[PDB]
Subunit: 69 residues, 10 copies
């Protein structure tokens, strides 16, 4: 899967349908994987650099693959 | 969903029915989403600014949408 | 539910029946709510002030309501 | 010295003259005590509730007394 | 249940059968309680003093009771 | 020097004369040692148990000796 | 099970099939144990030294045993 | 003083002349204020959003004013 | 300088003469280096393993060399 | 100044002459800058990746320039 955006987490959002949205770089993306909710908030809280990989690389696109550095 | 309150978490409360209450700004609101319990306590512990979005924007009103900054 | 004790968590204990015991102020109380186990240890670790509300306000009494400040 | 404001630290600012500004509640106040710079940032980072005591309780007023809870 | 060992967590280990091993003092003990896995790692990470209570107080013995201080 | 109070830090206060006040157990004590200011706030933030040793064991009394556990 | 690699976690990755990949030393390894996802991210965040034990000690190999120091 | 850049700290650098460099947004700026060295590293470590204010808003420019949010 | 003790910090103590005492393993040792006071408390708070090197390897002996792992 | 080593901090050491030694990658290097002592321990504690720049790129060599990521 190709890299979409790399950077620090600007903000995260819990959605009404239980999905989770994250804003990294200039993209707002969402994921339906429940395990990723606490992992991404932890990366936000500790200033980690994350790389999100997805073919739906556009605002509102979904993802499941993330690299935490 | 419209913004209701934005601010730091003043306190949180675990309820007898397993719901979770949060006090942000001048509103006390609750949520029945289990995943949000640890996320909101983490935001409280790290001084994050949260925005709660809900149509029931009054004391005792419920919510499911939160932005963590 | 009336306030029972307010203070910092002195210690916590995982029990053989999977319940969790907490010592706050001069009372040792237990809870059978699984979600509260990590929330109370987090409050212990970060020096939070907690208020436990219960009608069984005596050593060995149970509770489910807690306010985290 | 009378209480001026109580609340969580909204933001802090390092000034050109080496003083430190803090925004708590609806007041922006500054202090010239060097030691308080790291203590206030730590309170900001850990979501502590602080009470600033000063007779110059107005925007731009200075202070030296702070209670950390 | 009698005290077995008291001290800081030296190391922890995730086992192939999903049990968790902990080394406290001069004993290596394991537990099959899933909830204790994150609680013990948190105690390890924050330098907490733990007391493990078990009748199988020998290397390889199991436990379920732990006091976190 | 005899033990005065043992417990968790309830609150700390920076004073106008640059001394630091701490409330542990039922005593409010102060210290004029600059180094202790960040050490005591760190103990407050991490829920450490501290023992303050002083012959002036009364409200307003001073101290310089502290054990961090 | 023999030791494969010992060192600090260089990065972690959540995969599309819900497995988790970790880079320690010169090896990229994955695990299908859900519990290990938050434990390994916590070790990454706190600079812990980990030892991964596996017979598939090569890039892409899987593991279930980890020692956290 | 006008805002120059707002964002998360991408990296920091200790220089041979004892000044400190920070990369925020698309600018690499330095400061000669010793107190700011630990404050900026703490903001980096906790993922804070900072605004640097300076008239020398270009790579290599210096600053002394920072807002920590 | 030969190794004296290796282990986790059991407790630390600020002394009346401004020296700092640490208990590691079965030895209580002190140091007069001011910089080491916050470094050792940080190692205590984060459960680090420290090795103290000193020729005065006995209770009450002094040291200046410490390895933090 | 050319890069010497990049990696996570393996261990740090306080020396008898008040200098500070750090082991990154395959090199043990020291610095005489007092400010860097707490900054490097913080990077060790939070698993940061550091790049040390120095012309004395060999065991025992000194440095003053470090990039914290
Ligand atoms: C676990 C089962 N998944 C599930 O139910 O997902 C439904 C939600 N997905 C969704 O709305 O899918 C819409 C298309 O977008 C996903 C995109 O799909 C690609 C596909 O892989 C390519 O083969 C195709 O050529 O193009 C489409 C459109 O771009 O794949 C992305 C990953 O690269 C995202 O999928 C991933 O993230 C979602 C949301 O979290 C699910 O988890 C997917 O399973 C995961 O693969 C886009 O959503
Ligand atoms: C999926 C599980 N939902 C469920 O069982 O929720 C029952 C709890 N709901 C509740 O008490 O509902 C009372 C009405 O309040 C919710 C409010 O509803 C709006 C509605 O969306 C509008 O269309 C309508 O015009 O007005 C009503 C009243 O204002 O919507 C809020 C969000 O905007 C809250 O709902 C949200 O939060 C609750 C509690 O956490 C549930 O999670 C809902 O699913 C979530 O949408 C008010 O509770
Ligand atoms: C929802 C599942 N509950 C369940 O299985 O609870 C079993 C463990 N409960 C138990 O031992 O209860 C014994 C009585 O003690 C509880 C006490 O009950 C009060 C009651 O509310 C009053 O109306 C009555 O006049 O007096 C009794 C006895 O004092 O209520 C307490 C709260 O105020 C505690 O209950 C709470 O905590 C337990 C354990 O965590 C359960 O979670 C309860 O559901 C919760 O309400 C006392 O245990
Ligand atoms: C360490 C010596 N202090 C010094 O150099 O302070 C100079 C900066 N002070 C300043 O600008 O003072 C201007 C007046 O404002 C201070 C205010 O003063 C009150 C005074 O308390 C009353 O008794 C008087 O009736 O009215 C004046 C005017 O309001 O006192 C405040 C505290 O209550 C503030 O002082 C405190 O904070 C400053 C800045 O950090 C200094 O640290 C002072 O020493 C400290 O007392 C107002 O600044
Ligand atoms: C949840 C149900 N438990 C279960 O499936 O446990 C199986 C794993 N247990 C195990 O291997 O038990 C073997 C015996 O060792 C346990 C020991 O048992 C004592 C017993 O308490 C005495 O009364 C008896 O006289 O002697 C036996 C033999 O020593 O008890 C220990 C506690 O004191 C340990 O049990 C505890 O820990 C295990 C593993 O985590 C289980 O959780 C047990 O439920 C828990 O009680 C020894 O394992
Ligand atoms: C090294 C600089 N010391 C200095 O300037 O101290 C001035 C502030 N001290 C002060 O107000 O002292 C008043 C008396 O109180 C101290 C108390 O003194 C005992 C004394 O040790 C006994 O021998 C005597 O019998 O009784 C008196 C009064 O009870 O000693 C306390 C410790 O046991 C406190 O002193 C300590 O704390 C202060 C303030 O932080 C200084 O740091 C002292 O140096 C330190 O020893 C009481 O303040
Ligand atoms: C929980 C049940 N496990 C399961 O469903 O695992 C499927 C994932 N396994 C996998 O792909 O297995 C492929 C072979 O690699 C594993 C390796 O297996 C060795 C085996 O131990 C030797 O006895 C044999 O001679 O050679 C094979 C080939 O290498 O064993 C490793 C551990 O030493 C790894 O297994 C472990 O990790 C995986 C992934 O997390 C599973 O959890 C296994 O259960 C666990 O044992 C290699 O994956
Ligand atoms: C504490 C005394 N300061 C001192 O010794 O600083 C020497 C380092 N200064 C430096 O190299 O100055 C070069 C010019 O750049 C500073 C810039 O200056 C502007 C000035 O504000 C305008 O009025 C003028 O028209 O143009 C000049 C040229 O740009 O001002 C910046 C702030 O807006 C920076 O200064 C600040 O940061 C430096 C380095 O940390 C010092 O701390 C300054 O005191 C501080 O004001 C540019 O460095
Ligand atoms: C630079 C400031 N030094 C100073 O003022 O130190 C006075 C405190 N020293 C002290 O009490 O010395 C008592 C003897 O104990 C130190 C011990 O000394 C060795 C010596 O190095 C050997 O050459 C000799 O053969 O035996 C003596 C006795 O064992 O050395 C120890 C380290 O190996 C300790 O010294 C270190 O720690 C102290 C206290 O922190 C000072 O920092 C010393 O500078 C430091 O070297 C014993 O205290
Ligand atoms: C602040 C004053 N510095 C001071 O007193 O430093 C004395 C300790 N330095 C030392 O032992 O120097 C020995 C040579 O090693 C340093 C090395 O020097 C280079 C030099 O820059 C080149 O121009 C020359 O061609 O080769 C020599 C040898 O390689 O420079 C290094 C930086 O690249 C190190 O210096 C840096 O670190 C030390 C220790 O912390 C001091 O802080 C230096 O000031 C700092 O520049 C080597 O130590």
């Amino acid at each position: 899967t190709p890299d979409c955006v790399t950077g620090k987490v600007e903000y995260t959002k819990y959605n009404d349908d239980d999905t989770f949205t994250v804003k990294v770089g200039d993209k707002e993306l969402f994921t339906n994987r429940w395990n990723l909710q606490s992992l991404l908030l932890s990366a936000q809280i500790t200033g980690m650099t994350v790389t999100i990989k997805t073919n739906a690389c556009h605002n509102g696109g979904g993802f499941s693959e993330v690299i935490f550095r």
